[PDB]
Amino acid sequence: DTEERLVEHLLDPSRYNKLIRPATNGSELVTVQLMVSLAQLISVHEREQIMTTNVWLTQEWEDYRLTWKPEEFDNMKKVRLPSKHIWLPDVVLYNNADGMYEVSFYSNAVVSYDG
Amino acid sequence: DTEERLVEHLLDPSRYNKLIRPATNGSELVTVQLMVSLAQLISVHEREQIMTTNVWLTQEWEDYRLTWKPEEFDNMKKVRLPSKHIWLPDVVLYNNADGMYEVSFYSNAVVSYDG
Amino acid sequence: ETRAHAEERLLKKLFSGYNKWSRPVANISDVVLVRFGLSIAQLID
Amino acid sequence: ETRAHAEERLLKKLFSGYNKWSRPVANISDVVLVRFGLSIAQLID
């Protein structure tokens, strides 16, 4: 019950906007910390020069307009949010072949009270 | 007639929210009983180390906000509902190759009045 | 007076309060009859 | 006052009366200039 009201409070279209990025203090840069972890190395087609891998890329970034008071919402530290709604920086293989560029599943994103 | 109004009462977007999982009294565990049934063993490609099989995985979980009074509506015991609308736990194979993770058909789900 | 204008009013009227996931039957005990048939365009392989 | 809020106000004002399919030109007789450019990432095969 409380999670529903909390998510409705955070993801209000009038209050939160998906298009513009968050920024403070005269266009300060928003740092994105990414690191890769490969689950299995599928194949290496040497004849076609193609390496097929299965990759999890974990991305961290700070965001200020998503902060909430944790004490009011029953002391919740973390909440799930759909990746399609909240803003996210696009990260894609720049030298990728075979057309496919972006990630597949668009998993849900964890959001802490700090932002 | 009563079936339509009952389904509309259950699946009201302003009343039921899919993005949040059910919980009572601060993150109590919701159990998920799943069991597998092997339809047939389709193929085994040992050259690429891939086993293609036909599987029916049955999932059962208790849910409380979908309950309804049976005495009010012509003593209806069970109702069918679409999968994409009601919440469903994500149970996909990890060691799965070929990228494909989630199930294909997204069949209807039976719901009893108990929950 | 045109045919399209009348069909538009019909389509607006019947889809006004119609549901998709409700199994359309008069009573709970009554059944439906799904006449089923096949045709083969070609036998690929 | 903050920059993000100003950009939000701009984006809200801008898309109020903008239609996608309409070809944006001052007059019908006037033309547009589409500067076009290519770049080769790689030659796959």
UniProtKB/Swiss-Prot annotation, chains A, B:
The lineage of its organism: Eukaryota, Metazoa, Chordata, Craniata, Vertebrata. Glycans are attached at residue 25. It comes from Homo sapiens (Human). It comes from the Eukaryota. It is linked to Epilepsy, nocturnal frontal lobe, 3: An autosomal dominant focal epilepsy characterized by nocturnal seizures with hyperkinetic automatisms and poorly organized stereotyped movements. The record marks 110 as: Key residue for a rapid dissociation (K(off)) from the conotoxin BuIA. The gene is CHRNB2. It is found in: Synaptic cell membrane; Cell membrane. The record marks 58 as: Key residue that may interfere with effective access of the conotoxin BuIA to the channel binding site. The chain holds residues 27 to 141 of 502 of the full protein. This is Neuronal acetylcholine receptor subunit beta-2. Belongs to the ligand-gated ion channel (TC 1.A.9) family. Acetylcholine receptor (TC 1.A.9.1) subfamily. Beta-2/CHRNB2 sub-subfamily. Neuronal AChR is a heteropentamer composed of two different types of subunits: alpha and beta. CHRNB2/Beta-2 subunit can be combined to CHRNA2/alpha-2, CHRNA3/alpha-3 or CHRNA4/alpha-4, CHRNA5/alpha-5, CHRNA6/alpha-6 and CHRNB3/beta-3 to give rise to functional receptors. CHRNA2:CHRNB2 and CHRNA4:CHRNB2 nAChR complexes exist in two subtypes: LS (low agonist sensitivity) with a (CHRNA2/4)3:(CHRNB2)2 and HS (high agonist sensitivity) with a (CHRNA2/4)2:(CHRNB2)3 stoichiometry; the subtypes differ in their subunit binding interfaces which are involved in ligand binding. Component of neuronal acetylcholine receptors (nAChRs) that function as pentameric, ligand-gated cation channels with high calcium permeability among other activities. nAChRs are excitatory neurotrasnmitter receptors formed by a collection of nAChR subunits known to mediate synaptic transmission in the nervous system and the neuromuscular junction. Each nAchR subunit confers differential attributes to channel properties, including activation, deactivation and desensitization kinetics, pH sensitivity, cation permeability, and binding to allosteric modulators.
Swiss-Prot record, chains C, D:
Glycans are attached at residue 27. It is found in: Synaptic cell membrane; Cell membrane. Neuronal AChR is composed of two different types of subunits: alpha and beta. CHRNA4 forms heteropentameric neuronal acetylcholine receptors with CHRNB2 and CHRNB4, as well as CHRNA5 and CHRNB3 as accesory subunits. Found in two major stoichiometric forms, LS (low agonist sensitivity): (CHRNA4)3:(CHRNB2)2 and HS (high agonist sensitivity): (CHRNA4)2:(CHRNB2)3, the two stoichiometric forms differ in their unitary conductance, calcium permeability, ACh sensitivity and potentiation by divalent cation. Cells produce predominantly an (CHRNA4)3:(CHRNB2)2 nAChR. Belongs to the ligand-gated ion channel (TC 1.A.9) family. Acetylcholine receptor (TC 1.A.9.1) subfamily. Alpha-4/CHRNA4 sub-subfamily. Component of neuronal acetylcholine receptors (nAChRs) that function as pentameric, ligand-gated cation channels with high calcium permeability among other activities. nAChRs are excitatory neurotrasnmitter receptors formed by a collection of nAChR subunits known to mediate synaptic transmission in the nervous system and the neuromuscular junction. Each nAchR subunit confers differential attributes to channel properties, including activation, deactivation and desensitization kinetics, pH sensitivity, cation permeability, and binding to allosteric modulators. It is linked to Epilepsy, nocturnal frontal lobe, 1: An autosomal dominant focal epilepsy characterized by nocturnal seizures with hyperkinetic automatisms and poorly organized stereotyped movements. This is Neuronal acetylcholine receptor subunit alpha-4. The chain holds residues 31 to 75 of 627 of the full protein.
